[PDB]
Design a protein around this ligand. Structure first.
Ligand SMILES: Nc1nc2c(ncn2[C@@H]2O[C@H](COP(=O)(O)OP(=O)(O)OP(=O)(O)O)[C@@H](O)[C@H]2O)c(=O)[nH]1
Ligand SMILES: [Mg+2]
Lengths: 66, 154, 141, 58, 160, 161, 50, 465, 116
RNA sequence: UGUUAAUAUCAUAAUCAAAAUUUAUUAUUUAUAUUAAAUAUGUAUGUGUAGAUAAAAUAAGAAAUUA
């Protein structure tokens, strides 16, 4: 009885993002991802003469050496 | 297949005598019938034994039929031959089931329990990760890790 | 109920023979504890061999492909660091995240005692002949 | 309906059961329900054993 | 309803490995958890063997905690919702009444007068419908509005 | 510390002689048992170890079956069917007077172990190599199964006239 | 998941509302409830048998 | 009883081939008068002849037509009624007929564009909805056979459990920020190519790299089939990068081609509309630790739950939502499904008994689903069998398992007649399709049947008089 | 050097599961790909309601404390460092009665007693 | 079957913690994951393996030679 700042909140079982909105999660940044696809593909076509297997570690996966 | 430690050797007579507890385990008769209906084989033996044990379970809570006081005694070895035909039926069926599983395991490329012979891959029994560094039946030292049985493509 | 017989007298000087006996017993424990901690911590810091079993999927796949290529291309440094011990191995597997729950449900791991032999053993007599004087609860080589 | 079929042999089962016209509510019977319903119901029943205001104004 | 084995088995004589008999603490009981109560070999009773892997009540308590772990696994797996503390003003109307707490009143009905006695303790709301509430004033809706399925629409489901 | 290089009385104590034999009373020797399995007699060792098929294996088998069935392959199928036609023919009615011999009474105590020991040691020797009570061999006719792997329907381009 | 227990004031939201940890604090004040803080979030086990 | 004077009819189809030994199915299928059997193996009918008057009846597929039209295999449990001797028999359900007519409009979709839009409600294809216990994946297999008998390029995903729940997952090589499905897609290329070799030999590349890294002497891919052949006919672990390349550029091809009708049939899009059993690998797996004592690292010490990968994070689903969500492709038709192959959960759960678990190969998912809120597809409701389809399907089971001998055979005087075996099956299933398929099997242990002992008493009571 | 050795030093308050030390931004999959995979991703994290997410539900937990939620995969409990109850089994009220078999009672009151 | 109600005429032996096995009259946990709360058993891998021995017809499912 002093104001809404004390009205106790409700607990809503807010569902996680459904599939209709999970489907856009593959096309998010599709333009930049496909561009870096077209470039990484050229580095990969290069690399296939260097090693037996071309992992994404040498493409877009990155780690600090030490 | 998880259970790969050692197992206990029981004869068919006592494996069958467990009656409707495990021998006529209905959910095990079923799950071995599923191996047959997968492989595409007629289930003549398991169905014969299922018929026999359905009879025996239906007529377990009941009393035997009365004997007559015959010095000549024929009922005795006649019911004896009856029982021991039922028993032989079930011995054949025991062997059929065991064979089909130890062959299907070589087909699924799954490893059988310890010293469970699978003539689909190895003429002797599967020995590996055993409580003894000697062969349980050949007294041959085991390799580390467990011996390998099937191909490596899965 | 027969009247329980009194325990006879302990004897002469035995109170002090037990003194010296226990004395050199804890004396011997000194070295036993020393050597046992030596053996246990070398057991701890030693890079162990495989905890899994190669008799089940996904660890029955070839040593070139599938979860094995993931093992070489994400965790190959971590396992050699943490000494292949089955506990940290399975936890790095739980945190690799790209196998799901399988690091229990589908993966088959060696028993606790087949798991704790050092890297690259080829006998079955190793676990059954490990030293029995190092009171490591079997936590020694 | 089974309550209507005269299973009797000699005497005529007339009158028939007055239930011979009950509806069918999958929402009433058969008893189907979900498990959190079952649990919350029973544990709430259990915990509210004491919360009795024995002095109402009935 | 669960065809799992909840109870640890009575500590009795040694169950062998034959038909109908496993090790009392083999690798298959509780998904391999009997490793934490198993000891190996024909234990010397006097000198070896852990005194708490011989009793029945403590081993059964361990097993009970493990069963509870399992119930918790499956229960928290069963969530596609999260509890978002919406103020009173914005929550959709079914959450605007006096909802007694858990285990306080009968698990309350959503609304009787509107033909839905659905568990409001078990009513789940989607972000793409509560969008006007939470992040209404955050620019472009991070999710799209929901595409509906029309059941009056004359499609292959209506035999045309 | 400075662990003494001579031990006075503790190390001198009587040596508790290690347990000689194994098993009950640590006296059960190291010699063959009733439990030994045989790899020379039958595709199923006798006495067999208990196996247990699971639904995991039923599904793995069903999937293997889809693959070997859609790869045109029928050879392991006809192998299955032949190893089935080997052991699944009806065994003859036993001759009247032929019965599994129970262990004869009035030698051992009722609760003894030798009673079941003889039963297991005879049920071992009665191998599939000793199953003379069922029809097996080139002397058996099978009026219920198919005679040649050509009558199987996967080779159904053979019976056409 | 490894989630940081966050709690935003009743002032940051563009609708104020009494937040549940503050209500927890008011209750552990009224009925002198000890708030054990090492209480991990992954251990909300209930006694099924009970 | 007319066993010697019964002759075998000739061989023309696989169902003509799977006739059991007359002694086995002798009393099962009564031979009546030239004396011939009462029950018969159903005719291998083509869908182009299958029409309104095959409904609620059983047709089939021969081993040949099946090996022709299902090289990746079938869906979830679809080889359960197909042991070698069994003729693989499909029912012509009243919704499977609607799907066949939809495909009958497909191979001329261009003339029927507005036709199918009226038929799709602008929703991209149909998702088959219904509980666990229906004919979903088998329905999709019927649809696949339909289309491939119409010469349509059919991307048939046999299980979404394989795509979101493999034995492993990986970063997609040429798809930064994303992932691809290495082994499930390894099989996908191999079996989509070895399936549609017909269309993909004449197929020509539109938006693809003609500078593909090809092993020496191996021929550069110029067809769409050559792409996949180079894609899976390779040594590992090069196959994983080749396969992500193949998924991305094959999807670019399939989303670029505008003319040839394309069928895409996905079993269990509810396992595509959400997160995969893979999660993201630890950041401390992305930094090459230096030492253990003092690094502030708790991955070797304790596990934790890194957030879960939505299926939209794989490249195959990437192109698949790229086909669904991206319009202007009214050539592609998405007949996806809803699988309910998870383990159960009913308030409690102990530790499921290893040997006794019919859901071990179920996915530890438990999670809900909603056909409407979780799909762009239109729901086609395949509810449970009526006793109608139950009865037809079951007559097929209970009598062709005889005519191939797979069932009771010369022991037929022990399990009841059809009108009581079916009463028992339909009770124990509640007309449920799966309950029926498995209580036609659990029939072995039906330990409370008296039809045969009451009939034996009638015979050993009357055959006196 | 207390934290260098995780299992030696357990306060009579210390409790399990012992939470791990946190990395930078392990929060969700959007922030995960933003910092860890695709450093140039468009979205900072999953767009968050400005309100309160009681993820840890219904357990009210101390804010500012990095906590886990009750796990999902049945593996992590097998593969945690959680012990089993080895010594005696106490409850602060039941411990008056000292065992089940010797269950004590002050007065012979009914077990279904409805206290006023 | 130890502690119990009428025989007298050697001596204080009685748990409040931390304890010393010779006492027939006892069902131990068996190889994916092994020490966190009054502390809580470190020994015995071995062909289920001498001799003699244990229990049971009771919600489990047993079948035939009376004094
Ligand atoms: N031969 C044949 N079998 C069918 C048919 N319909 C159903 N079945 C059989 O019964 C199985 C179960 O039906 P489905 O709906 O396809 O199986 P499913 O539930 O999708 O499989 P999971 O996702 O693994 O649970 C079928 O997969 C087949 O084995 C059919 O039309 N022909
Ligand atoms: Mg399916």
């Amino acid at each position: 009885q002093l104001g809404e700042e004390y009205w106790p909140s409700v607990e809503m079982k807010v569902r996680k993002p459904s599939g209709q909105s999970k489907a856009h999660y593959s096309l998010i940044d599709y333009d930049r991802i496909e561009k870096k696809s077209r470039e990484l593909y050229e580095k990969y076509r290069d690399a296939k003469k260097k090693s037996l297997f071309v992992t994404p570690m040498d493409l877009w996966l990155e780690v600090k050496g030490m | 297949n998880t259970f790969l430690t050692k197992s206990v050797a029981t004869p068919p007579i006592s494996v069958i005598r467990t009656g409707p507890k495990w021998w006529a385990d209905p959910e095990r008769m079923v799950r071995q019938k599923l191996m047959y209906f997968t492989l595409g084989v007629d289930q003549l033996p398991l169905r014969r034994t299922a018929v026999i044990q359905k009879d025996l379970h239906r007529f377990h809570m009941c009393k035997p039929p009365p004997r007559i006081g015959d010095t000549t005694g024929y009922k005795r070895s006649r019911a004896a031959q009856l029982t021991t035909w039922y028993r032989r039926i079930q011995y054949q069926e025991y062997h059929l089931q065991h064979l089909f599983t130890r062959h299907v395991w070589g087909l699924v490329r799954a490893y059988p329990g310890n010293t469970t012979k699978i003539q689909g891959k190895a003429d002797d029994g599967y020995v590996g990760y055993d409580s003894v560094p000697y062969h349980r039946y050949n007294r041959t030292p085991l390799p580390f890790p467990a011996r390998e049985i099937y191909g490596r493509r899965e | 109920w027969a009247k329980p017989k009194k325990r006879p007298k302990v004897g002469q000087g035995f109170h002090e023979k037990a003194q010296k006996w226990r004395d050199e017993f804890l004396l011997d424990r000194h070295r036993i504890l020393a050597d046992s901690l030596r053996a246990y911590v070398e057991f701890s810091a030693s890079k162990r061999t495989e905890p899994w079993d190669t008799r089940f999927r996904p660890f029955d796949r070839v040593e070139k492909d599938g979860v094995y290529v993931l093992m070489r291309h994400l965790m190959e440094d971590k396992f050699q660091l943490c000494n292949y011990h089955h506990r940290p191995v399975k936890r790095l597997f739980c945190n690799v995240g790209l196998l799901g729950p399988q690091v229990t449900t589908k993966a088959r791991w060696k028993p606790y005692r087949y798991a704790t032999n050092p890297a690259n053993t080829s006998k079955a007599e190793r676990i059954f002949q490990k030293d029995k004087t190092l009171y490591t609860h079997g936590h020694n080589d | 309906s089974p309550m209507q079929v005269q299973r009797d042999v000699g005497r005529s089962e007339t009158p028939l059961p007055c239930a011979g016209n009950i509806p069918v509510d999958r929402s009433q019977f058969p008893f189907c329900w979900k498990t959190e319903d079952w649990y919350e119901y029973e544990v709430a029943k259990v915990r509210n054993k004491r919360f009795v205001f024995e002095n109402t104004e009935e | 309803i669960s065809t799992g084995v909840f109870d640890h088995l009575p500590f009795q004589h040694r169950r062998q490995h034959a038909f109908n008999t496993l090790p009392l603490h083999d690798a298959n009981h509780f998904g391999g958890r009997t490793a934490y109560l198993r000891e190996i070999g024909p234990v010397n009773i006097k000198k070896s063997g852990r005194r708490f892997k011989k009793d029945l009540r403590t081993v059964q308590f361990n097993v009970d905690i493990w069963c509870a772990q399992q119930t918790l696994r499956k229960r928290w797996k069963q969530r596609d919702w999260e509890v978002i503390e919406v103020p009173f003003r914005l929550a959709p109307a079914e959450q605007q009444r006096v909802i007694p707490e858990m285990y306080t009143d009968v698990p309350p009905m959503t609304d009787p007068e509107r033909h839905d006695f659905s568990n409001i303790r078990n009513k789940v709301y989607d972000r793409e419908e509560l969008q006007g509430v939470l992040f209404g004033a955050s620019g472009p809706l991070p999710y799209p509005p929901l595409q509906r399925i029309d059941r009056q629409a004359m499609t292959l489901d209506k035999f045309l | 510390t400075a662990t003494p290089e001579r031990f006075s009385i503790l190390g001198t104590t009587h040596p508790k002689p290690k347990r000689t034999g194994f098993g009950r009373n640590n006296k059960m020797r190291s010699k063959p048992s009733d439990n030994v399995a045989w790899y020379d007699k039958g595709p199923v060792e006798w006495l067999p170890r208990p196996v247990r098929l699971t639904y995991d294996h039923l599904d793995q088998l069903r999937d293997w079956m889809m693959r070997e069935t859609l790869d045109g392959k029928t050879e392991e199928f006809n192998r299955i069917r032949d190893m089935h036609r080997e052991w699944s023919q009806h065994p003859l009615m036993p001759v009247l007077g032929d019965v599994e011999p129970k262990f004869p009474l009035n030698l051992f105590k009722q609760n003894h172990r030798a009673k079941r020991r003889f039963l297991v040691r005879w049920h071992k020797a009665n191998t599939p190599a000793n199953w003379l009570w069922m029809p097996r061999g080139p002397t058996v006719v099978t009026p219920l199964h198919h005679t040649n792997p050509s009558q199987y329907p996967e080779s159904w381009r053979q019976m056409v006239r | 998941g490894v989630h940081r227990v966050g709690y935003t004031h009743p002032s940051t939201l563009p609708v104020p509302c009494a937040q549940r940890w503050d209500l927890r604090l008011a209750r552990a004040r009224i009925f002198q409830e000890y708030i054990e803080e090492k209480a991990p979030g992954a251990w909300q086990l209930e006694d099924e048998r009970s | 009883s007319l066993a010697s004077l019964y002759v075998r009819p000739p061989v023309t189809c696989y169902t003509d081939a799977c006739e059991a030994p007359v002694a086995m199915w002798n009393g099962a299928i009564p031979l009546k008068e030239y004396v011939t059997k009462l029950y018969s193996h159903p005719l291998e009918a083509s869908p182009t002849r299958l029409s309104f008057n095959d409904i609620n009846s059983m047709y089939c597929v021969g081993n040949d037509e099946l090996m022709q039209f299902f090289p990746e295999g079938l869906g979830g449990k679809v080889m359960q009624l197909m042991p070698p001797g069994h003729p693989r028999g499909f029912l012509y359900r009243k919704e499977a007929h609607l799907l066949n007519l939809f495909i009958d409009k497909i191979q001329h979709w261009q003339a029927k564009r507005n036709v199918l839009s009226s038929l799709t409600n602008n929703r991209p294809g149909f998702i088959i909805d219904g509980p666990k216990g229906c004919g979903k994946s088998a329905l999709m297999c019927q649809v696949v056979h339909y289309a491939r008998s119409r010469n349509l390029l059919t991307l048939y995903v046999p299980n979404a459990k394989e795509w979101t729940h493999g034995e492993w997952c990986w970063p997609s090589t040429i798809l930064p920020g994303f992932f691809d499905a290495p082994d499930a897609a390894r099989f996908f290329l191999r079996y989509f190519a070895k399936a549609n070799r017909s269309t993909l030999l004449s197929w020509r590349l539109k938006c693809t790299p003609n500078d593909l890294p090809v092993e020496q002497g191996e021929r550069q891919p110029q067809n769409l089939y050559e792409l996949c052949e180079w894609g899976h006919q390779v040594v590992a672990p090069a196959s994983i990068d080749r396969q992500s390349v193949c998924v991305k550029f094959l999807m670019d091809e399939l989303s670029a081609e505008k003319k040839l009708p394309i069928v895409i049939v996905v079993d269990g899009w509810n396992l595509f509309s959400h997160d995969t059993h893979f999660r993201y690998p630890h950041p401390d797996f992305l930094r090459t630790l230096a030492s253990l004592n003092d690094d502030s690292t708790d991955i070797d010490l304790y596990p934790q739950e890194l957030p879960r990968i939505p299926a939209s994070r794989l490249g195959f689903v990437r192109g698949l939502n790229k086909m669904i969500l991206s319009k202007d492709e009214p050539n592609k038709f998405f007949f996806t499904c809803t699988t309910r192959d998870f383990k159960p959960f009913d308030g409690i759960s102990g530790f499921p008994d290893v040997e006794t678990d019919r859901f071990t190969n179920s996915l530890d998912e438990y999670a809900p689903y909603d056909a409407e809120k979780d799909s762009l597809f239109h729901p086609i409701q395949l509810g449970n069998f009526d006793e109608y389809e139950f009865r037809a399907f079951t007559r097929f089971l209970v009598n062709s398992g005889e005519l191939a001998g797979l069932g009771w055979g010369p022991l037929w005087h022990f399990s009841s007649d059809f009108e009581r075996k079916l009463y028992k099956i339909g009770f124990l299933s509640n007309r449920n399709p799966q309950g029926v398929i498995d209580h036609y099997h659990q029939e072995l242990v039906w330990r409370y049947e008296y039809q045969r002992t009451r009939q034996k008493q009638y015979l050993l009571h009357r055959n006196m008089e | 050097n207390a934290s260098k050795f995780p299992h030696e030093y357990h306060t009579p308050t210390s409790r399990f599961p012992t939470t791990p030390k946190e990395k930078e931004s392990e929060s969700d999959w959007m922030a995960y790909t933003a910092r860890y995979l695709d450093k140039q991703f468009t979205h900072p994290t999953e767009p968050t309601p400005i309100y309160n997410v009681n993820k840890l539900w219904p357990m009210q937990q101390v804010p500012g404390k990095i906590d886990q939620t009750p796990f999902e995969e049945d593996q992590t409990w097998l593969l945690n460092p959680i012990p089993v109850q080895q010594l005696e089994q106490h409850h602060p009220e039941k411990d008056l009665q000292d065992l089940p078999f010797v269950n004590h009672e002050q007065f012979p009151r009914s077990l279904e007693w409805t206290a006023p």
